[PDB]
Motif scaffolding. Structure first.
Motif, PDB file in Angstrom:
ATOM      1  N   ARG A  90     -27.006 -52.323  -6.064  1.00 41.82           N
ATOM      2  CA  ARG A  90     -28.489 -52.924  -5.569  1.00 41.82           C
ATOM      3  C   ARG A  90     -28.183 -53.683  -4.310  1.00 41.82           C
ATOM      4  O   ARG A  90     -29.003 -54.074  -3.573  1.00 41.82           O
ATOM      5  N   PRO A  93     -27.764 -51.666   1.183  1.00 41.80           N
ATOM      6  CA  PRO A  93     -28.774 -51.088   1.935  1.00 41.80           C
ATOM      7  C   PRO A  93     -29.029 -49.740   1.304  1.00 41.80           C
ATOM      8  O   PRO A  93     -28.073 -49.018   1.045  1.00 41.80           O
ATOM      9  N   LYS A  94     -30.265 -49.233   1.576  1.00 47.50           N
ATOM     10  CA  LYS A  94     -30.642 -47.814   0.820  1.00 47.50           C
ATOM     11  C   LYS A  94     -29.933 -46.813   1.365  1.00 47.50           C
ATOM     12  O   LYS A  94     -29.364 -46.208   0.458  1.00 47.50           O
ATOM     13  N   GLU A  95     -29.702 -46.832   2.436  1.00 51.00           N
ATOM     14  CA  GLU A  95     -28.901 -45.759   3.204  1.00 51.00           C
ATOM     15  C   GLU A  95     -27.475 -45.859   2.816  1.00 51.00           C
ATOM     16  O   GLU A  95     -26.856 -44.832   3.258  1.00 51.00           O
ATOM     17  N   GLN A  97     -26.362 -46.645  -0.251  1.00 52.32           N
ATOM     18  CA  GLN A  97     -26.340 -46.378  -1.836  1.00 52.32           C
ATOM     19  C   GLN A  97     -25.945 -45.003  -2.334  1.00 52.32           C
ATOM     20  O   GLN A  97     -26.119 -44.100  -1.475  1.00 52.32           O
ATOM     21  N   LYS A  99     -25.322 -41.414  -3.774  1.00 57.26           N
ATOM     22  CA  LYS A  99     -26.014 -40.254  -4.399  1.00 57.26           C
ATOM     23  C   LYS A  99     -25.532 -39.889  -5.882  1.00 57.26           C
ATOM     24  O   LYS A  99     -26.246 -39.334  -6.577  1.00 57.26           O
ATOM     25  N   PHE A 119     -32.546 -46.538 -11.231  1.00 57.47           N
ATOM     26  CA  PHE A 119     -31.945 -45.686 -10.052  1.00 57.47           C
ATOM     27  C   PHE A 119     -32.057 -44.107 -10.416  1.00 57.47           C
ATOM     28  O   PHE A 119     -31.016 -43.554 -10.757  1.00 57.47           O
TER      29      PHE A 119
END
Ligand SMILES: COc1cc(CN)ccc1C
Ligand SMILES: COc1cc(CN)ccc1C
Lengths: 237, 300
Positions: A90, A93-95, A97, A99, A119
């Motif tokens: 969390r 940053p999103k990019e 995180q 997969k 998520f």
């Protein structure tokens, strides 16, 4: 799904992923009490969270105070691990995180999946590989920051030092796992191997010594000989 | 006592009526079932002799109308219908009764089995679970899927049972991850009982209906729903005392009625061993544990 030898190159593709190892989260010493019963004393631990492509290691230090007054600590430790990994994702940053998150022990699957329900696109997976990440506390600089810590704390390392300047992540991972396997099977010898040459030092900003390409091959060979040596001492072959 | 008359029996068929069953031969002079106890919901179900594929049937309550069964030679099944002309219906039923063309619902007077399987099963509860509101009766069959099964495909022909999923945001409060996963009381008491079902009567309703549909039709998703609803209770540390006692009673009579020879495909070894031996309520289901151990000890 489970990660194994058939899909091993997936580790080194461009999909962000982390390994999570919880072996060293809850650590105790076992001792006799004055009355001759047994009791445990906890010591500081750590979550080992590692991007196998970049070498970025998110070392979350687990201070003994987090166990105070808690029950069923082996079970809580899996959930505390899952809580701290979720907190890490969390905070990114999103990019950045992941997969996928790969847990080294299957007992981590439910605790992590439950903490990451938010998520749903992050795949939580086990692995059939036996990875030697428990030996991470045989790396002197990592052990030192864990034991010295007086509070919860996250420290960031690159467990590949500068190797990626010269080798691929596939090779750097293979080096790392052979080093950790060696430290796990015979710690004294492995360290002896790594330092017997005082002219090769560990840079202040590194974990492992500054070996040349040629010297790494020698070191790698000596570590394989050690793992074979110990296999021989063990099984009497 | 009420009656379900039949136009005829043109194809050979095993007929179920609640927990009873009887064979009717092709074109035998069969014109239905009489002396059906008023006061309970009932199910009349069918398995064709020439095609055991598709068990199917109809849940109904005789207090809600005059129903009858006619075979439909285009769709190939025995259909329930409603005759709204009361005069026509009494007259039609009286002539078949006089010619003794009907079997009698064979309720032994000592026998509370059907009541004990349906105690919480009224048609208003059943209407929440199936969707086809132009009729006062409800059709179920072997292959109907559940709303949860569609998520994991026609929504008109689905069983709307409430989705229970232990690893879902509904089940798990943010910040109580470990607590709510290992102790389901929040999910059972606040989410399901206080929020979705309203009381433990609508909740035991769906439970009992799910079992009946599993058993009478071999409906696999109903069987999942029955086990899920049991496990949620057994996996909750805090359950009202009266629900545990009634649950033990519910389950005892379900286990007692289950055919011995269907035990391998209707009972989930994992759920029952967990529920009886490991869960928070491992010691709270005395009657069910005693019957399970003496009847299905293999499974344990
Ligand atoms: C079988 O009983 C009935 C049959 C028809 C038409 N076959 C209408 C109404 C009733 C009651
Ligand atoms: C049995 O009663 C209910 C059932 C459903 C749908 N499974 C929703 C709401 C209620 C009260």
């Amino acid at each position: 799904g489970a990660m194994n030898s058939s899909n091993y190159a997936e580790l080194f593709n461009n999909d962000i992923k982390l390994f999570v190892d919880d072996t060293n989260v809850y650590r105790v010493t076992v001792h006799k009490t004055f009355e001759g019963n047994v009791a445990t004393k906890a010591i500081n631990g750590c979550i080992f969270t590692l991007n196998p492509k970049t070498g970025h290691l998110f070392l979350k230090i687990i201070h003994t105070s987090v166990w105070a007054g808690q029950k069923r600590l082996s079970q809580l430790a899996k959930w505390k691990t899952a809580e701290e990994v979720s907190a890490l994702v969390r905070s990114l940053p999103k990019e950045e995180q992941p997969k996928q998150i790969i847990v080294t022990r299957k007992a981590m699957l439910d605790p992590l999946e439950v903490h990451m329900l938010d998520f749903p696109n992050i795949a939580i997976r086990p692995t059939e590989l036996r990875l030697p990440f428990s030996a991470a506390m045989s790396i002197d600089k990592l052990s030192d920051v864990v034991m010295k810590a007086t509070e919860p704390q996250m420290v960031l390392f690159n467990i590949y030092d500068d190797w990626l300047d010269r080798i691929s992540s596939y090779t750097a991972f293979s080096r790392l796992t052979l080093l950790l396997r060696a430290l796990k099977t015979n710690e004294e010898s492995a360290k002896m191997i790594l330092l017997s040459d005082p002219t090769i030092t560990i840079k202040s900003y590194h974990l492992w010594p500054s070996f040349t390409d040629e010297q790494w091959i020698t070191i790698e060979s000596q570590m394989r000989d050690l793992i074979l040596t110990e296999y021989g001492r063990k099984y009497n072959v | 006592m009420n009656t379900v008359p039949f136009t005829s029996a043109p194809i050979e068929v095993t007929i179920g009526i609640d927990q009873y069953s009887f064979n009717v031969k092709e074109n035998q002079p069969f014109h239905g079932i009489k002396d059906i106890p008023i006061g309970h919901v009932h199910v009349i179900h069918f398995q064709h002799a020439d095609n055991s594929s598709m068990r199917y049937g109809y849940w109904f309550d005789c207090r809600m109308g005059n129903f009858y069964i006619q075979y439909d030679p285009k769709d190939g099944l025995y259909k329930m219908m409603e005759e709204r002309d009361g005069a026509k219906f009494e007259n039609i039923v009286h002539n078949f009764k006089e010619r003794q063309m009907m079997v009698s619902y064979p309720k032994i007077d000592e026998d509370d089995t059907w009541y004990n399987l349906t105690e919480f099963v009224q048609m208003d509860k059943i209407r929440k679970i199936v969707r086809k509101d132009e009729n006062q009766f409800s059709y179920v069959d072997s292959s109907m899927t559940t709303v949860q099964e569609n998520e994991l495909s026609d929504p008109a022909h689905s069983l709307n049972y409430t989705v229970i999923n232990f690893k879902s945001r509904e089940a798990i409060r943010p910040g109580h991850e470990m607590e709510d996963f290992l102790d389901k009381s929040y999910y059972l008491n606040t989410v399901m009982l206080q929020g979705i079902f309203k009381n433990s009567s609508n909740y035991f309703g769906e439970l009992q209906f799910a079992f009946l549909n599993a058993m009478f039709f071999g409906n696999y998703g109903s069987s999942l729903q029955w086990h899920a609803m049991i496990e949620l209770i057994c996996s909750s540390a805090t359950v009202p005392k009266h629900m545990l006692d009634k649950l033990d009673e519910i389950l005892y009579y379900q286990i007692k009625t289950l055919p011995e020879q269907y035990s391998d495909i209707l009972l989930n070894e994992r759920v029952w061993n967990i529920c009886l031996y490991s869960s928070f309520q491992k010691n709270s289901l005395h009657n069910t544990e005693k019957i399970m151990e003496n009847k299905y000890p293999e499974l344990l």
